[PDB]
Write an enzyme that holds these catalytic residues in place. Structure first.
Site, PDB file in Angstrom:
ATOM      1  N   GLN A  46       0.880  -1.165   0.000  1.00 13.85           N
ATOM      2  CA  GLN A  46       0.000   0.000   0.000  1.00 13.85           C
ATOM      3  C   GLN A  46       0.916   1.212   0.000  1.00 13.85           C
ATOM      4  OE1 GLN A  46      -2.088   1.664   3.477  1.00 13.85           O
ATOM      5  NE2 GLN A  46      -4.016   1.337   2.367  1.00 13.85           N
TER       6      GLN A  46
ATOM      7  N   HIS B  73      -3.187   4.401  -1.605  1.00 16.82           N
ATOM      8  CA  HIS B  73      -3.911   4.794  -0.402  1.00 16.82           C
ATOM      9  C   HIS B  73      -4.663   6.102  -0.633  1.00 16.82           C
ATOM     10  CE1 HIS B  73      -5.259   5.126   3.562  1.00 16.82           C
ATOM     11  NE2 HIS B  73      -4.180   4.748   4.223  1.00 16.82           N
TER      12      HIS B  73
ATOM     13  N   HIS C 121      -8.771   7.413   4.334  1.00 23.35           N
ATOM     14  CA  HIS C 121      -8.445   7.838   5.691  1.00 23.35           C
ATOM     15  C   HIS C 121      -7.827   9.213   5.903  1.00 23.35           C
ATOM     16  CE1 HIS C 121      -8.268   3.199   6.397  1.00 23.35           C
ATOM     17  NE2 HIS C 121      -9.480   3.634   6.101  1.00 23.35           N
TER      18      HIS C 121
ATOM     19  N   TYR D 243      -5.548  10.911   4.073  1.00 22.24           N
ATOM     20  CA  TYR D 243      -4.165  11.185   3.709  1.00 22.24           C
ATOM     21  C   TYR D 243      -4.162  12.036   2.442  1.00 22.24           C
ATOM     22  CZ  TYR D 243      -3.228   8.332   7.625  1.00 22.24           C
ATOM     23  OH  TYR D 243      -3.255   7.893   8.929  1.00 22.24           O
TER      24      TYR D 243
ATOM     25  N   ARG E 188      -7.500   1.973  -2.480  1.00 26.71           N
ATOM     26  CA  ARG E 188      -8.333   1.952  -1.288  1.00 26.71           C
ATOM     27  C   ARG E 188      -8.940   3.331  -1.069  1.00 26.71           C
ATOM     28  NH1 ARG E 188      -7.582   0.006   5.117  1.00 26.71           N
ATOM     29  NH2 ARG E 188      -9.145  -1.644   4.824  1.00 26.71           N
TER      30      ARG E 188
ATOM     31  N   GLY F 179      -8.406  -6.595   9.542  1.00 26.01           N
ATOM     32  CA  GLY F 179      -7.263  -5.898  10.101  1.00 26.01           C
ATOM     33  C   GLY F 179      -6.816  -6.454  11.442  1.00 26.01           C
ATOM     34  N   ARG F 180      -7.518  -6.081  12.503  1.00 21.37           N
ATOM     35  CA  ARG F 180      -7.137  -6.525  13.832  1.00 21.37           C
ATOM     36  C   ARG F 180      -7.125  -8.034  14.043  1.00 21.37           C
ATOM     37  NH1 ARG F 180     -10.943  -1.885  16.256  1.00 21.37           N
ATOM     38  NH2 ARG F 180     -12.046  -2.618  14.387  1.00 21.37           N
TER      39      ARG F 180
HETATM   40  C1  LIG Z   1      -3.031  -0.802  14.135  1.00 24.49           C
HETATM   41  C2  LIG Z   1      -3.771  -0.444  12.852  1.00 24.49           C
HETATM   42  C3  LIG Z   1      -3.075   0.227  11.789  1.00 24.49           C
HETATM   43  C4  LIG Z   1      -3.769   0.655  10.560  1.00 24.49           C
HETATM   44  N1  LIG Z   1      -3.038   1.241   9.568  1.00 24.49           N
HETATM   45  C5  LIG Z   1      -3.648   1.368   8.351  1.00 24.49           C
HETATM   46  C6  LIG Z   1      -2.842   1.504   7.121  1.00 24.49           C
HETATM   47  O1  LIG Z   1      -1.621   1.540   7.120  1.00 24.49           O
HETATM   48  N2  LIG Z   1      -3.539   1.624   5.980  1.00 24.49           N
HETATM   49  C7  LIG Z   1      -4.960   1.603   5.847  1.00 24.49           C
HETATM   50  O2  LIG Z   1      -5.454   1.879   4.801  1.00 24.49           O
HETATM   51  N3  LIG Z   1      -5.732   1.398   7.015  1.00 24.49           N
HETATM   52  C8  LIG Z   1      -5.112   1.179   8.160  1.00 24.49           C
HETATM   53  N4  LIG Z   1      -5.771   0.584   9.194  1.00 24.49           N
HETATM   54  C9  LIG Z   1      -7.184   0.223   8.949  1.00 24.49           C
HETATM   55  C10 LIG Z   1      -7.290  -1.265   8.637  1.00 24.49           C
HETATM   56  O3  LIG Z   1      -6.797  -1.582   7.345  1.00 24.49           O
HETATM   57  C11 LIG Z   1      -8.760  -1.739   8.739  1.00 24.49           C
HETATM   58  O4  LIG Z   1      -9.560  -1.093   7.696  1.00 24.49           O
HETATM   59  C12 LIG Z   1      -9.383  -1.537  10.109  1.00 24.49           C
HETATM   60  O5  LIG Z   1      -8.546  -2.142  11.122  1.00 24.49           O
HETATM   61  C13 LIG Z   1     -10.803  -2.014  10.301  1.00 24.49           C
HETATM   62  O6  LIG Z   1     -10.871  -3.440  10.142  1.00 24.49           O
HETATM   63  P1  LIG Z   1     -10.841  -4.475  11.356  1.00 24.49           P
HETATM   64  O7  LIG Z   1     -12.095  -4.305  12.168  1.00 24.49           O
HETATM   65  O8  LIG Z   1     -10.884  -5.848  10.605  1.00 24.49           O
HETATM   66  O9  LIG Z   1      -9.579  -4.301  12.144  1.00 24.49           O
HETATM   67  C14 LIG Z   1      -5.188   0.378  10.479  1.00 24.49           C
HETATM   68  C15 LIG Z   1      -5.879  -0.110  11.592  1.00 24.49           C
HETATM   69  C16 LIG Z   1      -5.193  -0.594  12.754  1.00 24.49           C
HETATM   70  C17 LIG Z   1      -5.966  -1.410  13.840  1.00 24.49           C
END
Ligand SMILES: Cc1cc2nc3c(=O)[nH]c(=O)nc-3n(C[C@H](O)[C@H](O)[C@H](O)COP(=O)(O)O)c2cc1C
Length: 364
Positions: free
Chosen positions: A100, A181, A184, A186, A233, A323-324
């Protein structure tokens, strides 16, 4: 056993063996100086290689793109060399990995900008939020973002070229795909949003103008490599880090999606909500998106295996990015397929640190 989450999916130039994807996750464990990926990061990704597709943590397209201390880049020779080892590790386990690429824009701080100057954005408006830096001991810390400088019109081509070059570097680095990206809050999203973009030139105002930059970037990267290697994204519905999508978010979102489909890119990744929550997507909106983008659609945002199966079965999305759950379960695919329990999450180690809370979540 499920139904369709564990069936192959053709994603542009690559074929995923299942639809359980690893969402891009910033973990801020890169080496400074240099924003260099590490062997530890290589191990972390290798542990999760069974994912249908691994989407890497957000990675800088240039030094100027940096907004978080510890986030890796893909613009220097040393970074490229380090990423080559990481992708090789994923491939050694028969996995697939996309990088990404981002430019944080106003979500940054002068102390981590080249020359220590103000970060850039669509307009000179502070994000009024915080980003993550590191203290003298290397520990992650939160700091108020620096007020940005509005990019000058003649600087825009340079931004487009930085994305183009980063994609060229991604190709050499061994990545299977690239994910722009544009979500969010950016840089790309800063231009797409009416609240962060107050420009009066052709890059501000109408949705056509606001989407101009991201579309020029898409065209540039498709030309550099191949459209079937490009993913993007977006988080077009709701508010993210003080960046809202405007009073006509749904309409503006569909305009952009239709434009993206014209390029025939590999996939559209929809981040549906901020971690803080948001209004759930209406089935009507999902339908509108579905019909405007004829490629793979990845859904993300507090998803559950049940929700993914439902929407995939309804033909509204093709894959889901977790993600998590992926942070805490390297073998999430196996666990979901076997209906096994998941490891508990440890949020305190999501950002920064070392192996603890990173590579110490066991597999079955
Ligand atoms: C620790 C962490 C770091 C993240 N960093 C990014 C990232 O680098 N790029 C992005 O597009 N979203 C980022 N996200 C969002 C995740 O890609 C994801 O959309 C989000 O965690 C919600 O999904 P989940 O409920 O499955 O965790 C981040 C979220 C968390 C928890």
């Amino acid at each position: 056993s499920a139904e369709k989450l564990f069936t192959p999916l053709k994603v542009g130039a690559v074929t995923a063996p299942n639809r359980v994807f690893m969402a891009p996750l910033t973990r801020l464990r890169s080496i400074e100086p240099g924003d260099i990926p590490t062997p530890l990061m290589g191990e972390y990704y290798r542990q999760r290689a069974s994912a249908g597709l691994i989407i890497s943590e957000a990675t800088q397209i240039s030094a100027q793109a940096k907004g978080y201390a510890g986030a890796p880049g893909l613009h220097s020779p040393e970074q490229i060399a380090a990423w080559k080892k990481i992708t090789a590790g994923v491939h050694a386990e028969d996995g697939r990995i996309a990088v990404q690429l981002w430019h944080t824009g106003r979500i940054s701080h002068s102390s981590i900008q080249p020359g220590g100057q103000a970060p850039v954005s669509a307009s000179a408006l502070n994000a009024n939020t915080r980003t993550s830096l590191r203290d003298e001991n290397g520990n992650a810390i939160r700091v108020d973002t620096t007020t940005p400088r509005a990019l000058e019109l003649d600087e825009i081509p340079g931004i487009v070229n930085d994305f183009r070059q980063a994609v060229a570097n991604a190709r050499e680095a061994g990545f299977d795909l690239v994910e722009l990206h544009s979500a969010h809050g950016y840089l790309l999203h800063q231009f797409l949003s009416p609240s962060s973009n107050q420009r009066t030139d052709q890059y501000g105002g109408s949705v056509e103008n606001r989407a101009r930059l991201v579309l020029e970037v898409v065209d540039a990267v498709c030309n550099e490599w191949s459209a079937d290697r490009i993913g993007i994204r977006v988080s077009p519905i709701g508010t993210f880090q003080n960046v809202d999508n405007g009073p006509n978010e749904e309409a503006d979102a569909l305009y952009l999606i239709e434009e993206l489909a014209k390029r025939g890119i590999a996939y559209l990744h929809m981040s549906e909500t901020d971690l803080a929550g948001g209004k759930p997507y209406s089935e009507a909106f999902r339908q509108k998106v579905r019909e405007r983008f004829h490629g793979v659609i990845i859904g993300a945002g507090a998803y559950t295996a049940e929700k993914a199966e439902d929407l995939i079965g309804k033909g509204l999305i093709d894959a889901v990015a977790f993600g998590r759950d992926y942070i805490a379960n390297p073998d999430l695919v196996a666990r979901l397929q076997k209906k096994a329990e998941l490891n508990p999450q440890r949020p305190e180690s999501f950002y920064g640190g070392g192996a603890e809370g990173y590579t110490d979540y066991p597999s079955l």
